[PDB]
Design a protein that fits this description.
It comes from Homo sapiens. By secondary structure, this protein is mainly β. It is built from two helices and eight strands. The structure holds the ligand Nc1[nH]c(=O)nc2c1ncn2[C@H]1C[C@H](O)[C@@H](COP(=O)(O)OP(=O)(O)OP(=O)(O)O)O1 and sodium ion (NA).
Length: 153
């Protein structure tokens, strides 16, 4: 088995809309997140990345899933811990690398999201927790994947 590097992903999910960020420098909408750093808990890394990437603060997050990504030709797995929150402080801010935008929950922009999101984001919307794994060739093609609803993440 490959080694894995820890990442976070945060979805700001309100009753009628979700906040996503478009990668500016590519072209896909995603939640907010990045690499966990030395000495911080995963949840604190998720809060930090949300603040660094979007400007938003939150005192707490709910863990909703974990997804492992494998890319053909890359030596490490990405171990992505997925969090949600419904409660925000501040306005999202555009940066040189990210443009935030709200989407109504009948307009989730799946075609401009990573392909895996079509599989797990419906579970998130149903208040379900999940574990996933996806093996990609490049940015567009899934060669293998597993997904399971779990009671505890
Ligand atoms: N297939 C996929 N589907 C998805 O929904 N999110 C993915 C994904 N693959 C990666 N992600 C998420 C995980 C993480 O939040 C983000 C990728 O992290 P980044 O590359 O932004 O890390 P960092 O920006 O911290 O690294 P540096 O650029 O070195 O600072 O995208
Ligand atoms: Na990031």
């Amino acid at each position: 088995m490959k080694a894995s590097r820890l990442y976070t992903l945060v979805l700001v999910l309100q009753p009628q809309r979700v906040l996503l960020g478009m990668k500016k420098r590519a072209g896909r909408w995603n939640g907010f997140g990045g690499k966990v750093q030395e000495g911080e808990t995963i949840e604190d890394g998720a809060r930090r990345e949300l603040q660094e990437e979007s400007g938003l603060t939150v005192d707490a997050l709910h863990k909703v899933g974990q997804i492992v990504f494998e890319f053909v030709g890359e030596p490490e797995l990405m171990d992505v811990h997925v969090f949600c929150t419904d409660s925000i402080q501040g306005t999202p801010v555009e940066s040189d690398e990210m443009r935030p935008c709200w989407f109504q929950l009948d307009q989730i922009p799946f075609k401009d999201m990573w392909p895996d999101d079509s599989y797990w984001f419906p579970l998130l919307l149903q208040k379900k927790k999940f574990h996933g794994y996806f093996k990609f060739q490049g940015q567009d093609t899934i060669l293998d994947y597993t997904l399971r609803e779990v009671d505890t993440v």
